[PDB]
Symmetry: D2
Subunit: 386 residues, 4 copies
Amino acid sequence: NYQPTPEDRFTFGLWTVGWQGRDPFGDATRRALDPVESVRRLAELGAHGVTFHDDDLIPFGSSDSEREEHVKRFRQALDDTGMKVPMATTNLFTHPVFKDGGFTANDRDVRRYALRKTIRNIDLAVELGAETYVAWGGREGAESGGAKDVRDALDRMKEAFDLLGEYVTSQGYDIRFAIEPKPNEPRGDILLPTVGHALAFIERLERPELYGVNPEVGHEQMAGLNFPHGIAQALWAGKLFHIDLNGQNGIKYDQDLRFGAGDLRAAFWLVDLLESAGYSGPRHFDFKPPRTEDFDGVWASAAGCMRNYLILKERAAAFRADPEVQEALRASRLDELARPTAADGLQALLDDRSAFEEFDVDAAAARGMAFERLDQLAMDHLLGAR
Amino acid sequence: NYQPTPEDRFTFGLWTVGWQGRDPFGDATRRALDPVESVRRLAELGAHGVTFHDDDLIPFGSSDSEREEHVKRFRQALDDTGMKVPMATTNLFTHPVFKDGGFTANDRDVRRYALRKTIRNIDLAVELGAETYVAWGGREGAESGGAKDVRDALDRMKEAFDLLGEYVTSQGYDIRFAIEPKPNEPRGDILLPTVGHALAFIERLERPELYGVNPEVGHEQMAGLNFPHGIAQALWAGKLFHIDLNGQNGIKYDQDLRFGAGDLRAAFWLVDLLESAGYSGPRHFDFKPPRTEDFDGVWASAAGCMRNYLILKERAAAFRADPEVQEALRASRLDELARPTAADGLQALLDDRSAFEEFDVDAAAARGMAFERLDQLAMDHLLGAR
Amino acid sequence: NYQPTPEDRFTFGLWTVGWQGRDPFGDATRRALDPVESVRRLAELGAHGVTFHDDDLIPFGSSDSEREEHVKRFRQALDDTGMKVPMATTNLFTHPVFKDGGFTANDRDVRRYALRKTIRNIDLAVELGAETYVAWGGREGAESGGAKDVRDALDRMKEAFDLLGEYVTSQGYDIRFAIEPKPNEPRGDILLPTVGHALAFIERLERPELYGVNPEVGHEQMAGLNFPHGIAQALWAGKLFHIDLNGQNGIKYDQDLRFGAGDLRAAFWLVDLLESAGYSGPRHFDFKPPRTEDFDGVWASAAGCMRNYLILKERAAAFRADPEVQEALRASRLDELARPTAADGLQALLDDRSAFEEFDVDAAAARGMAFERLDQLAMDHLLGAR
Amino acid sequence: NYQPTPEDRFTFGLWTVGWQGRDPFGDATRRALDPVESVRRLAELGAHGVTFHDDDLIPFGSSDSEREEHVKRFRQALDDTGMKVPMATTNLFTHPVFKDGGFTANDRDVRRYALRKTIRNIDLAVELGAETYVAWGGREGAESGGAKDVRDALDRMKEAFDLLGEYVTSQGYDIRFAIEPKPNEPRGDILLPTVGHALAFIERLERPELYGVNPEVGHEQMAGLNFPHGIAQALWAGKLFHIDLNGQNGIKYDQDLRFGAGDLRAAFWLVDLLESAGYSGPRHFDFKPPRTEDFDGVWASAAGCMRNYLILKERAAAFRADPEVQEALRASRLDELARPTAADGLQALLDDRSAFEEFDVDAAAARGMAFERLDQLAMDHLLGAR
Ligand SMILES: OC[C@H]1O[C@H](O)[C@H](O)[C@@H](O)[C@@H]1O
Ligand SMILES: OC[C@H]1O[C@H](O)[C@H](O)[C@@H](O)[C@@H]1O
Ligand SMILES: OC[C@H]1O[C@H](O)[C@H](O)[C@@H](O)[C@@H]1O
Ligand SMILES: OC[C@H]1O[C@H](O)[C@H](O)[C@@H](O)[C@@H]1O
Ligand SMILES: [Mg+2]
Ligand SMILES: [Mg+2]
Ligand SMILES: [Mg+2]
Ligand SMILES: [Mg+2]
Ligand SMILES: [Mg+2]
Ligand SMILES: [Mg+2]
Ligand SMILES: [Mg+2]
Ligand SMILES: [Mg+2]
Ligand SMILES: [Mg+2]
Ligand SMILES: [Mg+2]
Ligand SMILES: [Mg+2]
Ligand SMILES: [Mg+2]
């Protein structure tokens, strides 16, 4: 009954089930979790692996000896459980030194520090077997217009990512970078605010093949955008390296609800797309168990992430396999959308009188698209009414 | 007193001052304008030129003889006034045949018709001297998830733009394309919904140098995004070919208010950016005089577009020239943002102990950014309190 | 299998299935429906009744003889089908005379005309058996700040509704008024923009008992508000006289999707609330079949409205009847929420040392609310996974 | 030059300039301010007074002896500076015990504790001379639909406010309550989310005359609503007891920018309304100096709040005094909006053939409203171009 196994590739950040519940108006409601306990409890729930920021695993300001001790404890728990570490990232947002950003801070010495802190954790990530290194520039942005020249900031952002790309290639590391966009919060506006802006920025880097995107459900929905559409564009570009799954109720602060909460139909179409396209990376949950919950509610919330993915996977597969749905897809001409508009070429199109001079515009206009019947079949499948 | 002249390059679409006021809940409140009158009245207001959709100038379904007559009347008014036509575009959204899109309609014969209708108007645009050809795919999208496979739709969109690029290069035309993004309306979600998505898509075309963006103030604000930030990214990529200026009050239907209305401070920072960067293209207003207005209010609204641009231009220039502002920009380290993070290179950065091992993180963290003082100087300049 | 019958009280506006598909960017895609055909087709689908604006039934500017003919044809179709007319309303938004509003137009003669047009249709509504008369002030508002003094406009709005209340009581009519809020569109901002503002306004009328609200799913969601919460407040006040059911995908133009589309989980909690509270009025669909559809898609879309209500009704009933859910509701202390905080009174509360001086604040703080487990049980029931 | 004096009645919360800069993603960037220093520094800037939560002034868990010491220190600083305390409020949101609310927590013992904590601070507020007691129910709400029965929660909310009203009247206190709405954050949805919902709720309390609203600029804008319109409705109802001034850039997390930032034109129309209506209460700033700033930037930001109010006050007064604006107001028939629609009464309106049978609907429809000219005069005045 919708039981996850490690083969489903479900992963969780240490900072997710470990969120203590401190929000901008309230103190923590839960004690801190030891990373080792989190690994053990997630393994028992059926997770495949965990992810981390450097500062989740090694407390900021630790000596090199305490650092080695923290990593050894962690690696032992991974060995004991069989859990993997597919992705790692850098905390460039919590410490007050990053209050105006890391890679695009106005202060040059902070930008250099940001790069050195990142490079140190890339080495550790590689040692733990991570294949993707995520960058979320949560402090790269501004509250006011004159504080940040955005062209200069983009030069600095490109400079930082180019240097990281030079570092991994000169070390011979087999790791790729994924940029995680977010439109706002904690800065008034954040640079590279959507999947689109991130994809466009990647094409201006020196080695674009090393960089993709790590889109998050809730972040694109904070701009009112269609998350499955944005994922489709990322797949079309060959840039979907990783994904952050959660839920969000509309345009407001980043809620990070468990996956399946928030916009349920968008979650259905997302799963349909990921499974149809054969996305093979981790199904990573970046979520926060609400601060109303005790530790029992934390693990119930984490289990619900995986359960909802598996239910939606079943419903989307039943939808696509239903002969009546396949007939409706042809009724709505989805098959024609997949055929080239003009494989005969430009000159033949120009000479084709059935394309313009003799095109019956009123007869084509009268054809219904039959989209509402198709969408109700999708609703029936989602709700288990078929 | 803030009087425009043709040298300011202010342009208007025929469909703007010509909007009859029909909205989804109401009949037209104004009679149709003859395009010739619009050209004459705009010339008297100080405009530089006009833009058009094919169907604004030539009524849909006109014979080739009526078509020639409509163009000749138009060209005579241009000659009489000295007005230019810097941009043209295609109507691929009003006729019911385009109800599921033009370039990405599920029906293949509609997609071919869409291309032939576009190519016919590219010829006319070139004949009238237009340098930019805009494409707004307002019907390319969906209300429901199963109606549109977005990867196939993007293949079709790329196919269409590649064919248009092949057409202009084989004809030897000196015209470039600009894609105008919009997140939604009239479709539930529109493909390429923001500047970012459009910029990323352009990099996958066969001849990317032929294509840029035509961002619109209100459209990016319908996604809650920072319009000056998005323009900065378009300039950074070298893709700001044209711009649509207007006003918008937040996340709601596309209001198309006169420029300066809506988000006034965003308008200030936009003008500051366009003038600082030396944008040399048309300052094009895509706006709708509210349907409360008679024809006197139409021309008052059009005049206000240009007036507000010129006032904001003066205030932004005074801001940047103020020695106290220049001092505050250095206080906030905008000069340091423009300097390379690591021109000494990767190895020197790795060997630089002042970048990490000996970096005083508490002293850097205590430095204030002085952004609020800078922003209040900007406010004082905008309001004329300095 | 989820078949509606007239006993389910499903009703539709004539303007819904009759929407021809004209939007702000496109011509109609469907021919006009005769109101008589709409009544017949809806009766065959299982609807209970229809609603109308005056101008849906009697074309604007009809003579008194044509008017009588239109009503007689309509009444014959009602007699032939058994369909009821539970609600009627006035079109105070389509004609250009209403461009600045009806009840709050700046021009006094327009406000008087608006009242006379309304009163004429109240007489007809009563003759057809309507129990609720809806007012949607879609043109009452402004695009700019100086155009409308809102205190004066509210005086005029109160004056209009007071006069309507005097009219129905002096005629001895058994009809009540329902105000339908909407935050924006077609005006930049609309007066009484949410359920809350409407409820507050009603308390200042001379006869508040005659007035309630007609909330619409999509309208509250255009302000990012929680529609079931707003309905709960309307029920708590005893003011839910009527309801408009449809779907909406977030903060954007008013989509009027079929009910169940848009925010599916909000639709579930709405149905749960309406059925639990014993709301006995019409389940009215104010929706627009998308303009992609032909007439077959129109009736498929209307049928889907009713189907989705009935599926959600079944799932909500199963949720509330599940013993495991009843146990979880007690685990989350929903039973304690329903018990008075201080039925012992103020003085006993002040003397209760267990309420403050001896209250163990750390022990109460450690109690988990168990909300995530409860919400996953609700998800399982919605998806038919239990 | 726009210098505030105590006669302008500018007030600040202790928690505003005292905000240490901890946000959901970052540690504090500023040390804590002693309340006594804040009073002294604000007095030097020209403020009139300060406001406080109980927990701002007396650290949570203080003994009665430490409590007396904290109040005495505070009162001495008030005496030394001449600063007043016009408003006080309760912190019912920071401590983990309030994680599911205070007045509407599911746990009954928490609701009783919430009432006792409030009543204790009402006594202190009265002792310090406060005239208004604000309640912001920031934790009253839910992230999921089944967690909170909203009708029961509203019963509990009414019960709490009724008990507070009984307490102040039995003590003979001359203090009134103001409810501060907010739509979301930190809860997914907050009860009484807008001015409208709060106004409607007040009419169901046992002693409605004791309760009004404390609207906040940014909170109504988090729902995309027109803040001056909402203030106008609060004034129309006689319920504007207090106001929170700040700035907000659209629909996103609560930014609490300094007043004048965010939506500048809305700030202009707000000041125009408050001054025209003769609002005589405190001009209270609930803002957060961005965490980029050091203490010099904190006081620059606080000074900017007051400066921007005074500049906008001057521009709005010049607008209303300009003879050309007065002429334009009559051109747009603002004078007619203020005249009764039907002072002649219902029967005379029914008998008035010029109101319907002989009303020239086409001639009235052709009249322009001249709103765009009026709005450009308002723009010219705001920018100092007239
Ligand atoms: O970059 C890794 C993570 O860092 C922070 O926790 C962000 O809140 C999250 O969105 C991001 O995915
Ligand atoms: O593409 C040219 C224009 O076409 C339509 O009028 C759109 O509404 C406008 O946004 C666009 O700029
Ligand atoms: O008032 C009845 C109806 O009138 C209009 O059709 C509105 O768009 C709809 O929202 C409203 O319910
Ligand atoms: O109630 C007083 C204040 O409490 C909290 O600080 C809120 O964030 C603020 O909005 C409110 O005004
Ligand atoms: Mg996130
Ligand atoms: Mg997030
Ligand atoms: Mg994330
Ligand atoms: Mg537009
Ligand atoms: Mg627009
Ligand atoms: Mg445009
Ligand atoms: Mg509606
Ligand atoms: Mg609607
Ligand atoms: Mg409606
Ligand atoms: Mg606030
Ligand atoms: Mg706030
Ligand atoms: Mg406040």
